[PDB]
Design a protein around this ligand. Structure first.
Ligand SMILES: C[C@H]1CN(C)CCN1c1cc(NC(=O)Cn2cc(-c3cc(C(N)=O)c(O)c(F)c3F)c3c(=O)n4c(nc32)CCC4)c(Cl)c(F)n1
Ligand SMILES: C[C@H]1CN(C)CCN1c1cc(NC(=O)Cn2cc(-c3cc(C(N)=O)c(O)c(F)c3F)c3c(=O)n4c(nc32)CCC4)c(Cl)c(F)n1
Lengths: 122, 121
């Protein structure tokens, strides 16, 4: 029965994306083949089953660099990283398969479901 | 792009889980004798005071912040919970402390809602 601020979560996420864009308090670089992406571990863990598992693993929790499977499409990864920080998923016919396979790997179940629905819709 | 209307609230819920588990928290906020662990990114995202503090290169890496000792720790507790939940627990017995703490933390819409609460009582 508390007072709900309906825009608060999206305002927080916008500000987290602002911090990312300025490289403020980022603490990890994700490597996907030749491409690198700086991020906040906390956001990655809050958005992805794989990243939650990685950053709670004793072996990997203190690492500043995480190498993902180099078979992952870096554009597919970047689409999902942007989604994590914006709530907007840029699905197109040209990227649906790579995004869907990357979302499986990252363990982002509602993304995968939406990719399946995108296939149904086209 | 396709909008996921529940995503931001789900992210915030998971950040609150991390806070409760003390996972990747990087600062303790001291309010009188009371200690609150948090993530500086969330604090910067939710508070003009913490944004201004941690944006400074010479203060970015601080692991302890001592707030003004006149701040009511329950007022801070309410506002920290709000930062991580979007829910504000306002009561007649805490309104003045929450309002003054939100002024100090530079949380403008909380202050506005406290003014509305005063207008309604
Ligand atoms: C390990 C659990 C369970 N334990 C028993 C207790 C503690 N747990 C826990 C977990 C977490 N992190 C997560 O849950 C990370 N995460 C985030 C999501 C997720 C997806 C989407 C999307 N659109 O796909 C989304 O919009 C969104 F907003 C999301 F959040 C997700 C997921 O879809 N899947 C998975 N993990 C996801 C795995 C399966 C699919 C954190 Cl931070 C925390 F503190 N505790
Ligand atoms: C300066 C901006 C705009 N520029 C154009 C680009 C850079 N910007 C920026 C800002 C930030 N951080 C902040 O804005 C910190 N912050 C957060 C809030 C805030 C309050 C509430 C509430 N209910 O009260 C809320 O629900 C909510 F969701 C909030 F977010 C807030 C505020 O109310 N006030 C102040 N600061 C607040 C000062 C005055 C009042 C971060 Cl992290 C970042 F990376 N960039």
């Amino acid at each position: 029965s508390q007072i709900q601020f309906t825009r608060h979560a999206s305002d927080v996420l916008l500000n987290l994306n602002r911090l990312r864009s300025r490289d403020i308090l980022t603490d990890v670089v994700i490597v996907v083949s030749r491409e690198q992406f700086r991020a906040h571990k906390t956001v990655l863990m809050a958005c992805s089953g794989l990243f939650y598992s990685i950053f709670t693993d004793q072996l990997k929790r203190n690492l500043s660099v995480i190498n993902l499977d180099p078979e992952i499409n870096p554009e597919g990864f970047n689409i999902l990283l942007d989604f994590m920080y914006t709530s907007r998923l840029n699905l197109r016919e040209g990227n649906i398969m790579a995004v869907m396979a990357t979302a499986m790997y990252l363990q982002m179940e509602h993304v995968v479901d939406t990719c399946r629905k995108f296939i149904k819709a086209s």
